Amino acid sequence: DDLYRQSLEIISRYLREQATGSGAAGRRALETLRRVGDGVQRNHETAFQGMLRKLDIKNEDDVKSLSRVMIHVFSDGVTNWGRIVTLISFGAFVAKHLKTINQESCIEPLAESITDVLVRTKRDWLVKQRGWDGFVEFFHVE
């Protein structure tokens, strides 16, 4: 499952970079995600903080609530890349929090949960636009 694996790689890498501080298509997607994932947090820091508090994530594995949230976000039937990147960015915000409380925390369950929602529930929507190419082009700046 190339799309799942590619997506998980991009999302896992971003979450890990965010939480710790520390092919080419996947690379361009990750570069875009760094830029706009960081971008969407800007101005929304208070909102993200408030969401994190309500989310009340218990540990690295406690992803069920976030998954329900993500499914609910999409439950109006609208799908776009702004929503998707906001969910990933919030995921990174949550991952950063999990590491802050326990530095031995793995971001992997969170990244897998996010990727699951995106790839399983929007599979064909992603495939029709050649996956992450839609993301790269949507957020492409000249």
């Binding site: 706009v36 971008g39 969407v40 929304h44 909102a47 408030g50 969401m51 309500k54 989310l55 009340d56 609530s65 329900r68 949230v69 993500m70 609910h72 976000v73 439950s75 109006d76 609208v78 776009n80 890349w81 702004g82 929503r83 998707i84 990147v85 906001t86 969910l87 919030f90 949507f138 957020f139």
Partner: peptide, 23 residues
Amino acid sequence: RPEIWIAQELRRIGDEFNAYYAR
């Protein structure tokens, strides 16, 4: 309610951010 509150805010921000880049 908490999950719905979180989802409402994520959707608002996502759609905002989408419109920003769609423009």
